[PDB]
């Protein structure tokens, strides 16, 4: 049994980024991993001693989930040359990996693109509304992605978006979503938490895309799907590397083309979801894998 510790930036009950690592880690138990998870460690002064403690106790693999945990991972890695570490970040992380650290990245714009593409693939949805949080560069990039994905799959659809200015302000998110609904949105896309948007959607009988998996049953019932990271192949590769003695300096991109970004199991909502939605997304992924389709940089 390989002993694995996951050190998460936020809360694994978020039904989103941190839950994605927790779910991959749960599935990794079938590959012979014994897993411990610690949450809420975005603060590097808190993360570094926890990481050190797992390494000192003889864990085989210590995984820092989220860019905020990356620097502590890289620092402690230098102390334990025979322990294996993982960190996440931007493309520049590849440069900065000690011999015993694997790194990974993904592009926010691609999550947006898949949401928008799914939105444009639906039946009878000509008006789409999206609600995000603060207008930070990665959020604006995500939204530029949505617009592009939607234009690709349905160039006739119209699109409006609203920003709450905040992370995880469900009350403002709900209000923003209701405003788009009142103006005529036939689908609501969440780029932040989504639980507030989900409430507004239920009140107006419209489907959603992107809402947190931690939402209640009534809200989950209207969420067609959500674009997410599948970390399981990456984690499986870590175990294989450790078993073969080849761990270190791998740099993985999780993307649509390689199924690092995928959909959650699709829910049919109303009659807007085509029977072949998954096939359409699979074909999109194949076009990206081949380079038939190339996506712009969605950042300014």
Give the residue with the Cβ less far from Br ion, 248 or 270. Answer: 248
Specify the residue, 162 or 236, whose C-beta has the smaller distance to Br ion.
Answer: 162
Specify the residue, 102 or 271, whose C-beta has the smaller distance to Br ion.
102
Which of 39, 121, 154, 191 is the binder for Br ion (CB under 5 A)?
Answer: 39
Q: Which stretch binds Br ion (CB under 5 A): 7-15, 122-130, 264-272, 273-281?
A: 7-15
Alpha-helical regions (H) of 32-157: 44-56, 70-77, 108-120, 137-153
User: Taking CB under 5 A as the rule, does residue 19 contact Br ion?
Assistant: yes
Q: Which stretch binds Br ion (CB under 5 A): 17-25, 123-131, 263-271, 273-281?
A: 17-25
Task: Classify strands 84-88 and 2-8 as parallel, antiparallel or unpaired.
Answer: unpaired
CB 139 within 8 A of CB 189: no
Residues 203-232 that bind Br ion (CB under 5 A): 203, 213-216
Write a three-state SS string for 150-174: HHHHCCCCEEEEEECCCCCCHHHHH
Q: In the set 36, 236, 264, 278, which binds Br ion (CB under 5 A)?
A: 36
Q: Where are the alpha helices (DSSP H) in the chain?
A: 17-28, 44-56, 70-77, 108-120, 137-153, 170-182, 195-204, 217-220, 232-244, 277-290
- In this structure, the number of other CB atoms found within 10 A of the CB of residue 125 comes to 19
Stretch that binds Br ion, among 135-143, 183-191, 231-239, 263-271 (CB under 5 A): 135-143
Closer of 82 and 95 to Br ion (Cβ): 82
Angle between helices 232-244 and 17-28 (to 10 degrees): 50
At its nearest, how many Å lie between Br ion and the CB of residue 284? 10
Going by C-alpha positions, the residue among 125, 270, 232, 135 that lies closest to residue 191 is 135
In the complex, the smallest distance separating the C-beta of residue 275 from Br ion, rounded to whole angstroms, is: 25
Give the separation between CA 162 and CA 176, rounded to whole angstroms.
Answer: 6
User: Of 46, 76, 186, 168, whose CA–CA distance to 128 is shortest?
Assistant: 186
> Smallest distance, Å, CB 266 to Br ion?
18
Q: Which of 2, 67, 152, 202 binds Br ion (CB under 5 A)?
A: 67
Contact 3, 28 (CB under 8 A): no
132 lines the binding site for Br ion (CB under 5 A): no
Residues 176-195 that bind Br ion (CB under 5 A): 178, 195
Rule CB under 5 A: say whether 285 interacts with Br ion.
no
Instruction: Report the alpha-carbon distance of residue 120 to residue 115 in Å, rounded.
Output: 9
The residues that touch Br ion, with contacts defined as CB under 5 A, are: 9-10, 13, 15, 17, 19, 34-36, 38-39, 48-49, 66-68, 80, 82, 88, 107, 109, 134-138, 141, 147-148, 151, 160-163, 165, 170-171, 178, 195, 200, 203, 213-216, 245, 247, 255-257, 288, 298
């Amino acid at each position: 049994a390989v002993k694995v510790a996951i050190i998460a930036s936020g809360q694994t009950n978020d039904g989103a980024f941190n839950a994605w690592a927790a779910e991959a880690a749960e599935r990794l138990k079938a590959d012979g991993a014994d897993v411990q998870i610690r949450q809420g460690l975005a603060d590097p002064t808190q993360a570094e001693p926890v990481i050190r403690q797992f390494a000192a106790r003889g864990f085989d693999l210590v995984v820092g989930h989220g860019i905020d945990v990356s620097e502590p991972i890289l620092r402690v890695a230098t102390e334990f040359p025979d322990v294996h570490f993982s960190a996440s970040g931007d493309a520049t992380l590849a440069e900065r990996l000690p011999p015993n650290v694997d790194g990974w990245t993904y592009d926010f714009g691609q999550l947006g693109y898949l949401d928008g593409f799914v939105a444009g693939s639906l039946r009878g949805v000509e008006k789409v509304g999206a609600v995000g949080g603060p207008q930070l560069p990665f959020v604006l990039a995500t939204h530029k992605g949505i617009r592009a994905g939607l234009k690709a799959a349905n160039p006739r659809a119209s699109y409006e978006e609203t920003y709450t200015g905040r992370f995880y302000d469900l009350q403002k998110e709900q209000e923003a979503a209701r405003g788009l609904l009142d103006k005529g949105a036939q689908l609501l896309v969440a780029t932040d938490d989504g639980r507030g948007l989900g409430q507004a959607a239920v009140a107006g009988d419209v489907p959603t895309i992107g809402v947190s998996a931690a939402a209640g049953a009534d809200i989950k019932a209207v969420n067609i799907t959500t674009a997410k990271l599948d970390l399981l192949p990456t984690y499986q590769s870590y175990l294989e590397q450790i078993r073969a003695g080849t761990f270190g300096r791998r740099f993985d991109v999780l993307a649509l083309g390689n199924r690092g970004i995928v959909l959650t199991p699709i829910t049919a909502v109303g009659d807007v979801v085509p029977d072949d939605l998954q096939a359409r997304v699979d074909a999109l992924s194949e076009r990206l894998a081949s380079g038939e389709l190339r996506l712009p940089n969605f950042f300014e």
